[PDB]
Each structure stands twice: as structure tokens, then as C-alpha cells.
Amino acid sequence: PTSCNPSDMSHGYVTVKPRVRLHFVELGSGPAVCLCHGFPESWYSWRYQIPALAQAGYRVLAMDMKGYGESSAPPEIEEYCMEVLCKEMVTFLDKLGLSQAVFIGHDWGGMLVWYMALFYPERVRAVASLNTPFIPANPNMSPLESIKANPVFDYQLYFQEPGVAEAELEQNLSRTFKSLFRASDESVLSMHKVCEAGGLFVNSPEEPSLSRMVTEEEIQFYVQQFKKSGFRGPLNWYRNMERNWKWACKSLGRKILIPALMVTAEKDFVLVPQMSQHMEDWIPHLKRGHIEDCGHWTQMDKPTEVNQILIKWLDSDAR
Amino acid sequence: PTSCNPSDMSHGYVTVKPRVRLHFVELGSGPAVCLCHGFPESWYSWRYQIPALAQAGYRVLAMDMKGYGESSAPPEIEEYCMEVLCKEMVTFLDKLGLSQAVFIGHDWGGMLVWYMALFYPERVRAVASLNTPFIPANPNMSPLESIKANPVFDYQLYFQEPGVAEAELEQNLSRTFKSLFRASDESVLSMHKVCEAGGLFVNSPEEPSLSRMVTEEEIQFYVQQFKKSGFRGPLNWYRNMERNWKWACKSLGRKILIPALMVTAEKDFVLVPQMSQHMEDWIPHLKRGHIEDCGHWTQMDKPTEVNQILIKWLDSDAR
Ligand SMILES: CC(C)(C)NC[C@@H](O)COc1ccc(NC(=O)NC2CCCCC2)cc1
Ligand SMILES: CC(C)(C)NC[C@@H](O)COc1ccc(NC(=O)NC2CCCCC2)cc1
Ligand SMILES: [Mg+2]
Ligand SMILES: [Mg+2]
């Protein structure tokens, strides 16, 4: 599929708060489609979707999420809770004069677009998530308990202490992204042993091989982007679990009534497909896609299948 | 009418050439409408049209023309001929993924959108010009002769020598814009006596009064914008008369077949309405608007009337 050259894109900048601007690349004409990436990624993670969605007749706005790339990375940890992040994306639409837009997210971006649809459905024409399910908050057990119930999320505990995960992820940026951006059959890490091994990469190659999904040039773009603000901002998305839990509990009971799409990935061993099993009970108009042989990095693992699913769903339920 | 706060706008940047980027503000959703200002102005000259057109259901792209504001101001004089300027606006649409857009221009921007429609009609959905008529190039008499035939254009001769007009216009920026941005009944200068008086302002107040059209805050925005690159870039639009004449002659004979609108201003004593008298012979689908009591600075002189005319024409012939 056609990819993106960063130097030949239109770059937009919107100030949503005194010291917080958001950066995005923009391509195409038609209904506004806002793409929201995950951790630890970039607008560039949508490089295969941006020209395809624009050619299909949509105005693509691929964001650099707060803390990433050319977007502002404020220092405060609480600036990265879901309530603040969602309200700024509403201000983002306000400054652009957009009454609403289709929101498509992946990983942490998928969690954001779910709460945009949940708390601001009047501003979301349609919502789609890759890998990330929508599970209503349990007002009876803390996020500290729900993670201890699933050992796959032990890496999230290693991400909590500010400065610890930053030192490992920023020590060798090329090694960091070559070790993370891998197909499921090429994976070189276990999210189980992280807090027992003392880090994500300590039992991984220090000169890892290049995954079949990416080139050296694409890796170096991520390296150059994360030299701007580091990993603190991105990691702060994980450091508001209780805050996000209080906020999500304030919506309990209500359903998401707008058109929605859940795309599961067969080989995402963290955001597994069965975590989305009963989202239809909360999202009546939910449609589904499923990509076999697809790991966590859905957009670059199976870009063609992602483009097919999104364009088919956009043309039918979002137009 | 609702105006624009510069700090609350979405700002876009597109690189159209190695050392040349174009800056624009963007508001609204719908068909793309590209606004092109004149000399010596800014995207801010459309401040009353941008929210109105966006509310009417259009995606407004208000440019900072090359040499102005946050757009690049390359040093070469030939970089401001109409052929180069038009080709970059095509590249501008290319980078944004826009198959075409409605082009609306005023003054030198109106001259540009006419040649965009003339040479690139496949990229112009519809074209509208304020004050500036479309007169086909006479391949028999030079631009040096056509100006000597109309003494109103003597100021253009004063603008030819690089550095001379720059020194007068940049000496006191507040005085420059307060003296220029005036209603026709408040005018304080004669474009007739300029090359005989040795300048535009030499017979004008050195502490001129504030015109009823503008506030001190709006004047100071123009002052701050022109501190970036000065007046050379803007003045270079006038310094390619023969080059623009050769290029326009290469299209001789052909008509503009796309929807078009010519808006004349009753009190524009330079771009007088009768200069547009027989544009229908070259533009078969030309529609017209006329604003009484309106001087050269059409957008800020009669913003309400401009909004009414443009939205009515956009909804009927551009949608
Ligand atoms: C965890 C849970 C018990 C459900 N509660 C916490 C949840 O409320 C927080 O929401 C999240 C949503 C999505 C993600 N995605 C990732 O962690 N992807 C990683 C995959 C392996 C490589 C690095 C990135 C994380 C958190
Ligand atoms: C001049 C002609 C004989 C027709 N040939 C030259 C033409 O081909 C060049 O095209 C132009 C089109 C529009 C303008 N507008 C202005 O000069 N507006 C000024 C008004 C008074 C205050 C300062 C700005 C200038 C040149
Ligand atoms: Mg059920
Ligand atoms: Mg005739």
C-alpha cells in the first residue's frame, strides 16, 4: 500500500490550552476522519491508512497525540488522564470548526476514541477501534486490582514509577523501536516477566534484527521523533489509572448509540480478541472486523486488511 | 460580523518547494474554499469571511500568500511571477490531497485566482474575484505601455525599483497601514502624484487617524506580521509585469469555462468597476456582484455584503 513521506505532508497545529498545542497531518477532502495512535507511536503509524482513506473520499487528520512528536508534552502527569485528553480533542474540533468527526483509534488511542464516543457522542460521527475493546468501568474494584488479576499487564506496573521506564526506553531508541515494532512470530519480549526481570528489554537482544514489518528508515523516523520530548509524556498515559477509573464510573449505565466498529487482531497477546466479547451489550450498532495473523501493531502488520475494513465501514455507516 | 482571533485558529503549513512553505488558517468542513489576499495584506484580511463561510458549510483555507506573514519570502524577484505562484498553489492542492477547490481572490490574489482558473481549470471548482477584473493579455503592447496609458497606475512604476518603495513602506509600519487601510471617503493619498512627489505618503499625515474600518489592534496585527519579512516579497508581485505578460499571452484565445463570479466595488478608484465591462465574452458562466459605497479594501469595508454575495454564489454555482 501507498505510504507517506513526512516532508510532503500538510502539517496542522491547533492550540488547545495555553502551553499545549496539537500537531496533525492532513490529507484529502470529505468527511473528517481523526486518527489517534497508541503507545509508543506517532501519526506515522497511520502511514498506510492516510493515503488510502483520502483516496476513498475522506479528509484524514492523523494526530500526534499529546506527549508525542511535534505535539506539546506538558510535564504534569495528570495532564494525560482520559478526561483532559478527551476535552482537548473536543477543543481541537472546536478550533477547526468541525461539528463532528469520525474517530479511529489504536491501543491508547482506541481507548481515547471510545471515551470520546461515550462522553461526547454529539461530536463523534462514528467511532472505530483497533485492538482496544470497550469494557465499562467496574465501580467495585480498583485498577490496581484488575491488573493483578491479569499477569499480561505486569508491564503497566513497571510503567508507573516516573523515570524508571523512561531510562530503559530512552537508553537506545533504535533498539527500543526495533524490539517493540515486531510481528507476533518475531516477538523478543515477555510482558509477564518485566517487573520480575527489572525491565522490558533486559532479556532481549541488544542489537535486534529488523522486523519484516518495517524498514531502517521508518525506525529512524520514530527515533528522531522521540528525541524531541522523550518517553515521559507517552508513559504518562499509563499513570492515570485511578483517575480514568473515577471518570469512567461517572458514565455508568449509558450506552454508546453512535455507529461503531471493533477490529480485533488474532495474535495481539495483550489486547486479545476475547476481551471484546460482550461489547454489543453496551454498543447496539457495533460492527466488527477481525484480522488473522495480526499482532499488536495492526496498521503496519496488516495495512491492506486494515484499509479494506475501515473503508468498507466508513462508506456504509459513517457516510 | 464575527471576526477571527489569530491565537484560536488552526494553522496549516505546506512545503511547495525546497525553501518555500505556505501558511494558511483553516476553519470549517465541506467543499474546500481557498482565499487569496492582495497587497499588502494577510490571511487576516479575510477575518470577517472565514467564520461566515465556515458556518455556511465550507472548509475555508485562508492563505498567507508567498512573501507574506508566516509564509516563506524567497529573495528572488522572479519567484513572484504569476506562473511560479500559480504552479505552487497547484502543488499546495497536491500536498493537501485536494482534487480541486473554490478559489476566491482580492487585488493581486484576484489576479492569481483568475490565472488559476485560466491555466488550471481542472483544479478550480469555481473562481471568484473581488475588484480585480480578468482582461486578456494584449500581445501587441507591453505592460510598460499599458501603465503609461492609465495614470492611476503610476504607483506601480514607483514599486519597480527594488529597495525604494521598501524603505518608505517599512519606515513606519503603523503609519503605512493606517494610511492604506481607509475607506474611499477617508483616503489620504493620490496614486497619481506618487512618482512626481517621490513616494506614496510624502503628502500624507505622519500621524494619520484610525479609519472607521479598523481598530488599533487590527492595525498592530498587520504591523507585527510585516516585521517578519518586510515589503520586498509583497512588492515583488508588481515586479514581473513582462514575465506575467509573456505567460498570459501563451493562453490567448481560450475561455474560462468554470463557474465564475466578478464582484466590483463602486468606490475602488484604481480597480474601477468598468474595467470588468466585457469579461462575459471570455467567461460564459460569469455571474456578478456589485457593492455600493465600497472602496478598495472590500472585505473589511463591506464585510456583510461580501459574505452575502459569496455564500449565495457558493451555494448555487459551487456546490
Ligand atoms: C489493563 C487493564 C486491566 C485493561 N486496565 C487498564 C486500562 O484501563 C488501560 O487502558 C489501556 C488500553 C490499551 C493499552 N495498550 C497497551 O498497553 N499496549 C502495549 C502492548 C505491548 C507493547 C507495548 C504497548 C494499555 C492500557
Ligand atoms: C495595471 C495594469 C495596467 C492593469 N496592468 C498591470 C496588471 O497586470 C497587474 O495586475 C494587478 C492587479 C491588481 C493590482 N491591485 C493594486 O495595485 N491595488 C492597489 C490599490 C491602491 C493601494 C495599494 C494597492 C495591481 C496589479
Ligand atoms: Mg451480551
Ligand atoms: Mg461583449
Side-chain angles (χ1 to χ4, degrees), chain A residues 11-13 26 28 59 96, chain B residues 11-13 26-28 59 96:
Chain A
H11 295 259
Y13 303 87
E26 197 174 24
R59 172 186 177 182
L96 271 158
Chain B
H11 295 259
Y13 303 87
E26 197 174 24
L27 189 74
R59 172 186 177 182
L96 271 158

Side-chain angles (χ1 to χ4, degrees), chain A residues 7-15 24 26-29 59 95-98, chain B residues 7-15 24 26-29 59 95-98:
Chain A
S7 170
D8 298 311
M9 310 291 296
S10 177
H11 295 259
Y13 303 87
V14 172
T15 289
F24 63 98
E26 197 174 24
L27 189 74
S29 59
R59 172 186 177 182
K95 302 292 193 64
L96 271 158
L98 299 181
Chain B
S7 170
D8 298 311
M9 310 291 296
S10 177
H11 295 259
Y13 303 87
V14 172
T15 289
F24 63 98
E26 197 174 24
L27 189 74
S29 59
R59 172 186 177 182
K95 302 292 193 64
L96 271 158
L98 299 181

Side-chain angles (χ1 to χ4, degrees), chain B residues 90-104:
Chain B
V90 173
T91 303
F92 181 75
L93 300 175
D94 285 354
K95 302 292 193 64
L96 271 158
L98 299 181
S99 61
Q100 63 185 14
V102 178
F103 280 87
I104 305 181

